Design a protein around this ligand. Structure first.
Ligand SMILES: [Cl-]
Ligand SMILES: [K+]
Lengths: 275, 267
């Protein structure tokens, strides 16, 4: 029949220790597992585990520290929740390699394969999907910068087409390549460009890949009131629903319950009558 | 011998119909005073990242009814106005404000210094990395942020005095957060070396006030920045701050009292 599939909701699971010094890792691992269960309980389809933040102001960490953070978490989830689908947010080949050996089935590379020349190969030799994100910066840690564009849609489309080609040349087929236009500071600290990408998201379907976006209480949702993170849930729901309406196949979020429910409405609007 | 406590400046933002704002504004003003604020700083125009310009008429429409309401209901309240517009400062001073905080340090409106010169009010000159009063998201780097900010404040104090404002009515703010840089390290460096600014001979005013430079390694959002704000505000006082601007009057006043006590020499 003509049934439109629901969007896949990607729950964000960031593993960041509280204590700066050594010790207290079992406690942090246990906390991450509890959060993973809650994400699944709220209806997340994929749990995206990351040990290194890449938003503005974020610190770079070594592959060893990154693995020390996520490995115990991945192992605990795969062991107790084997039904759960795990994605790993990393730009390092060594980290991706280990994550894939442990059962992760998706790698989300904020640098679209530019940070580590070996990452595409690692993904190619697995059956994992790769999410290629557009970023205005070469460095995987994005900057606060009010970048301007003549036409952001063209710039991002051209970048994603080139990264898709590069991934395919490295051995990853098109059916395992997912594209993310980026939103917020990854695109620009000037919010207009994020809204323009959302308006024209359907144009990206021509690249022949599933689409992944993360409005997720980002900067661009501040609006006229200059709303801070705590007040951006309605805007996050609206932007995520509109993204689904315009073609998003995956929505990444910290607010699984609410964003899943808002996106269900977008899917229902896109659902043609059963006749 | 007894060192005076810092003056706490309570933030009262009047940024959104119109009339539904004033009784609520008076209620908040009363609460700021109840918590121990010495000055109520009314601001009708946001100047943080992503903000846009509002007209002088719109700014006046926002703040004037609030100033009038506070003067009437809370006559003992000292009022400051956060504005870069001469026309707005002029009206605020006529109505009783005794302090004008200019995020542009007199650069945005060539007539603002003259307006303040022709009053008995104090002016707060803040350092901003941008010429436009609405600050940008920009990870501005510096070879020596303390030297850059010090020289900027010196030049601005000189301009204020040239316009007719005496040194005893000039207050300096190094800026913190995005005004200095979207890279947090520079805000911490200014707090470390705040005592160096005492050489300019003016009282010092700072506003850590839950700014994003306080996010730290955990990338803490606003709701979780109170401990950092308390620590930063207390260290600012320890290092020479005469005024601390905040939304959290009670807690910041109490934390700052500890810094004052640490600065109190023995008997
Ligand atoms: Cl420099
Ligand atoms: K303001």
């Amino acid at each position: 029949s003509n049934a439109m599939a629901k969007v896949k909701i990607v729950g964000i699971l960031n593993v960041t220790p509280n204590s700066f010094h050594d010790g207290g890792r079992f406690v942090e691992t246990d906390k991450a597992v509890v959060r993973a269960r809650e994400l699944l309980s709220q209806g997340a389809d994929i749990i995206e585990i990351g040990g290194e933040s890449t938003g503005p102001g974020s610190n770079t960490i070594t592959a060893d520290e990154e693995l020390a953070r996520i490995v115990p978490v991945i192992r605990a989830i795969r062991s107790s929740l084997p039904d759960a689908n795990i994605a790993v947010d990393t730009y390092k080949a060594e980290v991706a390699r280990k994550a894939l050996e442990l059962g992760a089935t998706m790698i989300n590379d904020v640098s679209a394969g530019r940070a580590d020349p070996k990452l595409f190969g690692v993904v190619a030799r697995s059956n994992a999907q790769i999410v290629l994100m557009y970023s205005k910066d070469t460095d995987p840690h994005t900057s606060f910068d009010e970048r301007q564009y003549v036409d952001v849609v063209r710039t991002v489309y051209d970048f994603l087409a080139e990264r898709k080609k590069a991934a395919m040349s490295a051995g990853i087929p098109a059916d395992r390549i997912i594209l993310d236009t980026g939103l917020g500071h990854f695109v620009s600290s000037d919010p207009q460009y994020s809204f323009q990408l959302l308006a024209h998201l359907s144009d990206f379907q021509d690249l022949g890949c599933k689409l992944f976006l993360s409005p997720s209480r980002k900067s661009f949702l501040a609006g006229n009131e200059l709303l801070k993170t705590a007040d951006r849930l309605p805007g996050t729901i609206a932007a995520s629903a509109i993204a689904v309406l315009h073609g998003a196949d995956y929505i990444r979020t910290h607010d699984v319950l609410e964003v899943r429910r808002g996106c269900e409405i977008a899917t229902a609007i896109n659902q043609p009558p059963e006749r």
